[model samples]
Target: YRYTGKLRPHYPLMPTRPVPSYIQRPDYADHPLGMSESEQALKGTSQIKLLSSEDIEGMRLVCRLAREVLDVAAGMIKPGVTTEEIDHAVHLACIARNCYPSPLNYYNFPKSCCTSVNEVICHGIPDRRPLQEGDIVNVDITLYRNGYHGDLNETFFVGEVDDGARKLVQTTYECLMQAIDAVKPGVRYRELGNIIQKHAQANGFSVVRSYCGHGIHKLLHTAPNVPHYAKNKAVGVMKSGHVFTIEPMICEGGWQDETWPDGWTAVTRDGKRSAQFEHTLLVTDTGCEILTRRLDSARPHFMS
Candidate 1:
């Protein structure tokens, strides 16, 4: 019922950073209750929007920058660096590139990016605690540019994590790749779970069911809900130009999750560790293109 890991929430978060006047913010950015009217309008609409050539170009440009922004955050991940520091660093990096950090104020998320650590599966708000040696963490980032959103995240190794943590993090990345490999036109969105969950289960990991990938474009989050566990009734079929994410949160314990009272930071209920990797995918005629694929600076560190 209480915190399941050694990490505890630190108080006195730094003030939320502001985007510039010219950098167009999302509908939820300045909302009174941090609501996105555009996202609210998507409720109950069972339709997937396909992007045109112009929209695909927009997606490509923004996703490229989002990968760069994620790399900016990745370069600072080491023991003793507080997630608060990382958040500030990413916030500055976004504005520097003339992009809006997509997580900030999207439904009132306090931090510019997410820093899920140890047992925390996803949406872990950046806090004041310093990273300890052997702690594994994930940084989820999204950036808005040219009227589109680019989303991606990767789990990181903090000062040489243990083998169990290392394996979980690596497998999480593999599960995402496995799902992405199966992406193509006419493939049912529900089929991704079979690909992802199979890999996780075979590797002795559990797939987190609460959070799933989603369609993202003009609206930060939109249609075509994609679940990450097998037997889920997620709707919709993939068509070329359909963009969505396939992030899977693989767990070291039970797949169940619990959210903090502060209204974010989902953690594993069994108090065991969790790791996740995500990318915005564009469905092509043959397969999908990883719109947010890593660049040279963002090469993975955990791989052999």
Candidate 2:
């Protein structure tokens, strides 16, 4: 048995920050138990919500904010830098923009953002551990504004990374881009997984199957779960104005995943490296718009 030494969580997590009363909040924000009242009601509904013109505009703004926060957080990746510092920067950036850090307090997620280091698939809570050279980390940012949520994430190299890690990060991003390019009216949600899986397998990597992309607009998670594996049973056809995320988690080893004792961090069962890329997308009449598109300067140079 391979011993993947104890990946302990940094203790004494900072309490969830309070959002201003004036800022619009999601259904789960004010709940006593951090559960959304309408979650059950929205379940079993496969029909995607078609956003109106006004709703699309609202999503654009919040998505832009999410991208901005991700950019700032990503720029901080380096050896000796702590993920907790990155989360703090994200928190301040969100508040400066008058947007609520969506992950904060959502289902009681303690941190303002997610920092998934190597081997960690996703939902990695930001902590005090300092990043080391050659590490690849994914910074996930979601923000709420005007009653809607925008979500996205990108994997960044902590320093000089090896070819295997670089390939995984690059291929994971390509998988997401290829999936997003396939989005349009009349397209089936199941088709996305096919494209992602094809790319990941061809690159000698495996796709994480436990956590999939989901509808993100008014709720943190919603209908039409988007799997990253082939032949998934995900239902729904793309329609104009449909907004969601297409995030694919690619692993350097087996696709199976396991969670840490903290109940949040999900890591590869084989303790191998994993990378992911995410973008909030909006289906259009002809193609799709990447709502969380990064600035040219913000785009990672490793793709070149």
Candidate 3:
């Protein structure tokens, strides 16, 4: 738990916000230990859901709302703004849409959304540290609605970041898109790592190996483990109707990672910056559809 990055946890997180009873929730929502029983039941099984039209309908709606929620979080990134405030905004946005912020209480994740800044990789719980200029942060959002879950995230530049940070963020996006480009029926699940790894290394970056994407639907984090590094042993192949996430965490230094004492924040072992992008995909007979794709209004938001 020795500090590896410049960031530190803002302990004593804000009180866990309540979800309106009218909104549907996953089994883990009210669990005493934050353990997801549904996810636990699927352990050691590789059963990927080939979503039906009914399931797809729920996914499409939830993913669209997830994008909207992420946009709200992204637009608030600027110097002097605490990630705690961003988490608040994300919480309101999710509830307003009649969806539960999927991360809240899931495995005891305190925040409604994840706010990963600088060297902090994914799962950096939103804290009280104010975002400073020349920094890059990633906002990850997931929503559970009508018995399905939709997940996605994006990295944003806080004010005017240095060129190195900018390049890292931009290329992380490219790595995600390139991996998505290769997602189609019959494509091996491990193939995405090669596509992402090749693109990231060619651009002078490394891929974080510890965390990878997984199948998402009525349950979060299911079969078809989607690895984002090269030479991975991930199982299963992409099939039509397979709904899952493909997130690539590319760092400016070595791929090794270190976790904070909080037991959630994952940072680079070398203390260099990292960036990531994620999207839920639906494989089709010919190709894939970006279920959580951004709209035309999505942009690199700036606060004047």
Candidate 4:
């Protein structure tokens, strides 16, 4: 399922390309990565380092804005609401808080929030399609404010859903939680990927490797690509003030994915279902904090 845009051509369909030796191509697969030095390898550009304790107050404010937008969008998640409607809700919420929806117009993304439904994997653009019962939708939201950003997403049940959808959702959340638990000072970054992949595979799921969690601060994406697979070579040591996301994209079938003609929505290549859960996190002196998690207690964990 490839999405194309009226303003620009969609990404070409090709078999998985070999990993690149450098990180300059538009297709990340072509970006070459040697031994990672997330802590130092990509440091010459003066990119903002991951969050530290000194920036906690500022990060908290950005996370709060992100949460508020999600709350507003969740309130309008009934069957008749279209993705475009959700986009509108997200845009208004961000504007109301004087924050920016990070994805809007970024590389020609027209939607304010990503609303991926059913077979769509991620980057689904808001559209006229009204969500229906039994549909699984992934809403990826990123908020930028006060020189920082908070990014997170969750797959929601449109109404009552089936067993497969429930199971996928539950398993994905479990994988994310397990990965987060591994985050702390002095822990090897690769350990998180190992734990995430272990739990996900145990449930007969595959993690998408095309996109990974990233270092986040002032820039939307940064170093230390956090792969959600076992035995990955991710570099860096967990330290106080590190900030990143643990968004694991889990597939019910083949993990391969493709983009739509709209140029934004990415869907499963095998047309199988996929689910994801994401949260902007802060590495505390002792543990991790879910900065963008919702406060509502009524939301039920999905199971299949």
Q: Provide the overall lDDT of each model, using Cα atoms, as 2-decimal numbers.
A: 0.90, 0.87, 0.89, 0.73
Q: Write the per-residue lDDT of candidate 2 for residues 126-241, one digit (tens) a residue.
A: 98888999888899999999888999999999889999988999899889988988899999999999999999999999999999999988878897699999999998888898
List clash counts for every candidate, in order: 0, 0, 0, 23
Question: Which candidate has the top score in lDDT?
Answer: 1
The digit string of per-residue lDDT tens for model 1 on 71-154 reads 888889999999999999999899988999999988888889999999999999999999999988899889998789999999
Output the better candidate (3/4) by lDDT: 3
What's the residue-level lDDT of 233 in candidate 2? 95
The segments of candidate 1 whose C-alpha lies over 4 angstroms from its true place after superposition are 297-299
- In model 1, what are the clashing residue pairs, if there are any? none
For 45-75, candidate 4 gives per-residue lDDT tens digits of 5333655555787788888788778777767
Ranked by TM-score, the better of candidates 1 and 4 is 1
Evaluated with TM-score, which candidate comes out highest? 1
lDDT string for model 3 (120-147, tens) is: 9889898889999998899999999998
Compute each candidate's TM-score over C-alphas: 0.97, 0.95, 0.96, 0.82
Query: In candidate 3, which residue pairs clash?
Result: none
Output the worst ten-in-a-row residue range by lDDT, candidate 3: 295-304
TM-score of 4: 0.82
**TM-score, prediction 2:** 0.95
* Candidate 3 wrongly placed segments (more than 4 Å): 298-304
